[PDB]
């Protein structure tokens, strides 16, 4: 099963000769949990995520973003070490289905902490499973 985002990145950089990827290696990571959607007060719906990230230490992470599937809310992402806020922003309307969130600084610290299965939580005030994209450039 090929992620649609990874298939789009292949075709885009081949068709459009004006742009090239920010990094040579673009890796796609998948979520582990697939059965959680707790709801709480004020419409504050939350759900956790988990990823098996193994980025070689001899590479430099140029960019890393989290892709989330939606249908006017404030999407704030956390990291379970009791929760570490990574990035928080706002979404507009129910028309756009996907969204990206920069987590480059988080993956850079995980490269020093070593390869580990990290867990995150998202708070919104075959399926479209969220995935993680890592742009890393080799130094060898």
């Amino acid at each position: 099963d090929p992620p649609e985002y990874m298939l789009e990145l292949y075709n885009k950089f081949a068709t459009d000769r004006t742009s090239m990827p920010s990094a040579n290696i673009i890796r796609s990571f998948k979520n582990e949990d697939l059965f959680s959607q707790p709801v709480s007060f004020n419409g504050l719906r939350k759900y956790p995520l988990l990823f098996n990230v193994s980025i070689p230490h001899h590479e430099e992470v140029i960019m890393a973003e989290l892709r989330l599937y939606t249908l006017d809310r404030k999407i704030t992402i956390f990291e379970v070490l009791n929760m570490l806020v990574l990035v928080s922003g706002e979404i507009y309307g129910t028309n756009s289905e996907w969204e990206t969130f920069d987590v480059t600084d988080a993956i850079r610290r995980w490269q020093k902490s070593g390869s580990s299965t990290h867990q995150l939580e998202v708070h919104i005030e075959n399926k479209h499973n969220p995935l993680l994209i890592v742009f890393s450039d080799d130094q060898s």
Binding site: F13, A14, N24, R27, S54
Partner: protein
Amino acid sequence: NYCKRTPLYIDFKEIGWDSWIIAPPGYEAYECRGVCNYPLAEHLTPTKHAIIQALVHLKNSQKASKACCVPTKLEPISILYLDKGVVTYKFKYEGMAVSECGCR
């Protein structure tokens, strides 16, 4: 007969490499067919040893073997595959397609 850039289209489904290579289905890698005969031309990027080996085989074919028509420069291609079960896209997978042939 001559050391040239003979075309050679490839298909990963024929070699069962569809297991890890997601895309593309195939590409034009080309190949370097032909033979290297003394004197060697400068447009074939010869080496100092290849020039001597061709002269020695000319004198005695049993003394030394022939020079060979092999790729000298290899261009990269963008591929999408799974590296240890991880969907990886490499815009520059170096060493795949041939751009220049020669003798060594």
